[PDB]
Design a protein around this motif. Sequence first.
Motif, PDB file in Angstrom:
ATOM      1  N   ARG A  59       0.828  -1.201   0.000  1.00 25.07           N
ATOM      2  CA  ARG A  59       0.000   0.000   0.000  1.00 25.07           C
ATOM      3  C   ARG A  59       0.866   1.256   0.000  1.00 25.07           C
ATOM      4  NH1 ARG A  59      -2.477  -0.344   6.180  1.00 25.07           N
ATOM      5  NH2 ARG A  59      -0.471  -0.063   7.256  1.00 25.07           N
ATOM      6  N   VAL A  60       0.648   2.120  -0.988  1.00 27.49           N
ATOM      7  CA  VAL A  60       1.408   3.359  -1.101  1.00 27.49           C
ATOM      8  C   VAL A  60       0.480   4.558  -1.266  1.00 27.49           C
ATOM      9  CG1 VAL A  60       3.080   4.653  -2.465  1.00 27.49           C
ATOM     10  CG2 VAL A  60       3.400   2.195  -2.102  1.00 27.49           C
ATOM     11  N   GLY A  61      -0.019   5.072  -0.146  1.00 30.01           N
ATOM     12  CA  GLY A  61      -0.912   6.215  -0.188  1.00 30.01           C
ATOM     13  C   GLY A  61      -2.149   5.954  -1.025  1.00 30.01           C
ATOM     14  N   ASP A  62      -2.061   6.253  -2.317  1.00 26.81           N
ATOM     15  CA  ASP A  62      -3.183   6.048  -3.226  1.00 26.81           C
ATOM     16  C   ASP A  62      -2.759   5.216  -4.433  1.00 26.81           C
ATOM     17  OD1 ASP A  62      -4.131   7.942  -1.409  1.00 26.81           O
ATOM     18  OD2 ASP A  62      -3.758   9.600  -2.803  1.00 26.81           O
ATOM     19  N   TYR A  63      -1.783   4.338  -4.226  1.00 29.36           N
ATOM     20  CA  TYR A  63      -1.283   3.485  -5.298  1.00 29.36           C
ATOM     21  C   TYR A  63      -1.107   2.049  -4.812  1.00 29.36           C
ATOM     22  CZ  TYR A  63      -0.327   7.727  -7.968  1.00 29.36           C
ATOM     23  OH  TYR A  63      -0.447   8.914  -8.654  1.00 29.36           O
ATOM     24  N   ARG A  64      -1.612   1.101  -5.596  1.00 31.02           N
ATOM     25  CA  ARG A  64      -1.511  -0.311  -5.248  1.00 31.02           C
ATOM     26  C   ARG A  64      -0.394  -0.988  -6.036  1.00 31.02           C
ATOM     27  NH1 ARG A  64      -3.265   0.070  -1.230  1.00 31.02           N
ATOM     28  NH2 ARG A  64      -5.361   0.721  -0.561  1.00 31.02           N
ATOM     29  N   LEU A  65       0.527  -1.621  -5.320  1.00 30.95           N
ATOM     30  CA  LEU A  65       1.649  -2.308  -5.953  1.00 30.95           C
ATOM     31  C   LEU A  65       1.552  -3.816  -5.742  1.00 30.95           C
ATOM     32  CD1 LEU A  65       4.394   0.097  -4.546  1.00 30.95           C
ATOM     33  CD2 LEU A  65       2.924   0.441  -6.540  1.00 30.95           C
ATOM     34  N   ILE A  66       1.413  -4.553  -6.839  1.00 34.64           N
ATOM     35  CA  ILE A  66       1.313  -6.006  -6.776  1.00 34.64           C
ATOM     36  C   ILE A  66       2.667  -6.661  -7.020  1.00 34.64           C
ATOM     37  CG2 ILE A  66       0.226  -8.063  -7.725  1.00 34.64           C
ATOM     38  CD1 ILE A  66      -1.177  -4.484  -8.011  1.00 34.64           C
ATOM     39  N   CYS A  67       3.303  -7.111  -5.943  1.00 38.34           N
ATOM     40  CA  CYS A  67       4.606  -7.760  -6.040  1.00 38.34           C
ATOM     41  C   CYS A  67       4.518  -9.223  -5.620  1.00 38.34           C
ATOM     42  CB  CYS A  67       5.630  -7.027  -5.171  1.00 38.34           C
ATOM     43  SG  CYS A  67       5.482  -5.226  -5.217  1.00 38.34           S
ATOM     44  N   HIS A  68       5.575  -9.979  -5.898  1.00 36.32           N
ATOM     45  CA  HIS A  68       5.617 -11.394  -5.550  1.00 36.32           C
ATOM     46  C   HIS A  68       6.798 -11.693  -4.631  1.00 36.32           C
ATOM     47  CE1 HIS A  68       5.520 -15.878  -6.879  1.00 36.32           C
ATOM     48  NE2 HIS A  68       4.667 -15.650  -5.897  1.00 36.32           N
ATOM     49  N   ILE A  69       6.505 -12.246  -3.458  1.00 36.07           N
ATOM     50  CA  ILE A  69       7.543 -12.580  -2.492  1.00 36.07           C
ATOM     51  C   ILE A  69       8.069 -13.994  -2.716  1.00 36.07           C
ATOM     52  CG2 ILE A  69       8.118 -12.844  -0.059  1.00 36.07           C
ATOM     53  CD1 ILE A  69       5.699 -10.921   0.485  1.00 36.07           C
ATOM     54  N   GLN A  70       9.391 -14.122  -2.791  1.00 39.59           N
ATOM     55  CA  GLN A  70      10.020 -15.421  -3.002  1.00 39.59           C
ATOM     56  C   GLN A  70      10.887 -15.806  -1.808  1.00 39.59           C
ATOM     57  OE1 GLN A  70      12.119 -15.683  -6.749  1.00 39.59           O
ATOM     58  NE2 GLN A  70      10.273 -15.207  -7.935  1.00 39.59           N
ATOM     59  N   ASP A  71      10.318 -16.588  -0.898  1.00 37.12           N
ATOM     60  CA  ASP A  71      11.040 -17.029   0.290  1.00 37.12           C
ATOM     61  C   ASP A  71      12.314 -17.775  -0.094  1.00 37.12           C
ATOM     62  OD1 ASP A  71       8.724 -16.263   2.082  1.00 37.12           O
ATOM     63  OD2 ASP A  71       7.780 -17.880   0.931  1.00 37.12           O
ATOM     64  N   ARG A  72      12.232 -18.566  -1.159  1.00 36.52           N
ATOM     65  CA  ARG A  72      13.377 -19.337  -1.628  1.00 36.52           C
ATOM     66  C   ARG A  72      14.645 -18.487  -1.617  1.00 36.52           C
ATOM     67  NH1 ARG A  72      14.071 -23.484  -5.273  1.00 36.52           N
ATOM     68  NH2 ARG A  72      16.257 -24.185  -5.286  1.00 36.52           N
ATOM     69  N   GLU A  73      14.568 -17.310  -2.230  1.00 35.19           N
ATOM     70  CA  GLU A  73      15.709 -16.404  -2.291  1.00 35.19           C
ATOM     71  C   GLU A  73      15.342 -15.028  -1.743  1.00 35.19           C
ATOM     72  OE1 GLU A  73      18.466 -16.349  -5.790  1.00 35.19           O
ATOM     73  OE2 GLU A  73      17.199 -18.007  -6.478  1.00 35.19           O
ATOM     74  N   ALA A  74      14.366 -14.998  -0.842  1.00 31.56           N
ATOM     75  CA  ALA A  74      13.923 -13.746  -0.240  1.00 31.56           C
ATOM     76  C   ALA A  74      14.014 -12.595  -1.236  1.00 31.56           C
ATOM     77  CB  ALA A  74      14.744 -13.438   1.002  1.00 31.56           C
ATOM     78  N   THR A  75      13.398 -12.777  -2.401  1.00 31.66           N
ATOM     79  CA  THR A  75      13.411 -11.754  -3.439  1.00 31.66           C
ATOM     80  C   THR A  75      12.004 -11.240  -3.723  1.00 31.66           C
ATOM     81  OG1 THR A  75      15.371 -12.718  -4.517  1.00 31.66           O
ATOM     82  CG2 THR A  75      14.004 -11.221  -5.830  1.00 31.66           C
ATOM     83  N   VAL A  76      11.863  -9.920  -3.785  1.00 30.99           N
ATOM     84  CA  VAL A  76      10.569  -9.302  -4.051  1.00 30.99           C
ATOM     85  C   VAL A  76      10.526  -8.699  -5.451  1.00 30.99           C
ATOM     86  CG1 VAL A  76       8.876  -7.604  -3.287  1.00 30.99           C
ATOM     87  CG2 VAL A  76      10.333  -8.757  -1.608  1.00 30.99           C
ATOM     88  N   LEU A  77       9.842  -9.383  -6.362  1.00 34.13           N
ATOM     89  CA  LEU A  77       9.723  -8.915  -7.739  1.00 34.13           C
ATOM     90  C   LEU A  77       8.336  -8.334  -7.999  1.00 34.13           C
ATOM     91  CD1 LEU A  77      10.973 -10.655 -10.945  1.00 34.13           C
ATOM     92  CD2 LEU A  77       8.693  -9.637 -10.811  1.00 34.13           C
ATOM     93  N   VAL A  78       8.297  -7.074  -8.423  1.00 32.59           N
ATOM     94  CA  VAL A  78       7.036  -6.404  -8.711  1.00 32.59           C
ATOM     95  C   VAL A  78       6.410  -6.938  -9.994  1.00 32.59           C
ATOM     96  CG1 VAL A  78       5.882  -4.182  -8.973  1.00 32.59           C
ATOM     97  CG2 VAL A  78       8.005  -4.338  -7.652  1.00 32.59           C
ATOM     98  N   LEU A  79       5.125  -7.270  -9.925  1.00 35.17           N
ATOM     99  CA  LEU A  79       4.407  -7.793 -11.081  1.00 35.17           C
ATOM    100  C   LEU A  79       3.651  -6.682 -11.802  1.00 35.17           C
ATOM    101  CD1 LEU A  79       3.087 -11.230  -9.819  1.00 35.17           C
ATOM    102  CD2 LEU A  79       4.142 -10.840 -12.054  1.00 35.17           C
ATOM    103  N   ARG A  80       2.796  -5.980 -11.064  1.00 36.68           N
ATOM    104  CA  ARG A  80       2.013  -4.889 -11.632  1.00 36.68           C
ATOM    105  C   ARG A  80       1.979  -3.693 -10.686  1.00 36.68           C
ATOM    106  NH1 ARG A  80      -3.401  -4.735 -12.147  1.00 36.68           N
ATOM    107  NH2 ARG A  80      -4.361  -2.693 -12.560  1.00 36.68           N
ATOM    108  N   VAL A  81       1.891  -2.496 -11.257  1.00 39.19           N
ATOM    109  CA  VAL A  81       1.850  -1.273 -10.465  1.00 39.19           C
ATOM    110  C   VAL A  81       0.852  -0.276 -11.042  1.00 39.19           C
ATOM    111  CG1 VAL A  81       3.132   0.777  -9.766  1.00 39.19           C
ATOM    112  CG2 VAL A  81       4.205  -1.480  -9.605  1.00 39.19           C
ATOM    113  N   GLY A  82      -0.198   0.012 -10.279  1.00 39.82           N
ATOM    114  CA  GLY A  82      -1.209   0.949 -10.732  1.00 39.82           C
ATOM    115  C   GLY A  82      -2.020   1.526  -9.588  1.00 39.82           C
ATOM    116  N   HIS A  83      -2.600   2.702  -9.810  1.00 37.37           N
ATOM    117  CA  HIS A  83      -3.404   3.361  -8.788  1.00 37.37           C
ATOM    118  C   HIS A  83      -4.538   2.454  -8.319  1.00 37.37           C
ATOM    119  CE1 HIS A  83      -6.021   6.283  -6.793  1.00 37.37           C
ATOM    120  NE2 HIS A  83      -4.980   7.094  -6.755  1.00 37.37           N
TER     121      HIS A  83
END
Length: 89
Positions: A59-83
């Motif tokens: 959650r970013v104020g008025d913007y929704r960020l859809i990311c994917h958490i990867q426990d395997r390598e503790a990596t956060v890759l953003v999938l989609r970003v939009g208001h």
Amino acid sequence: MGYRIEFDPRAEKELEKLDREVARRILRFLRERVATLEDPRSLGEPLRGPELGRFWKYRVGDYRLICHIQDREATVLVLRVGHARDVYR
């Protein structure tokens, strides 16, 4: 300790298209808040749906960020970003 910050080839554009201040706010919010956050699942919530599940949203104020958490390598890759309006949530 700090998870990795990655951005898909689709989001990168969906984000860059956004305002300048807004873009910097998001990237930083993840490289500042989440970066320090012992865990990526702190300032975000898991999506909801029978089709999609394994996905973390931030959650970013008025913007929704859809990311994917990867426990395997503790990596956060953003999938989609939009208001909030753009996203279906």
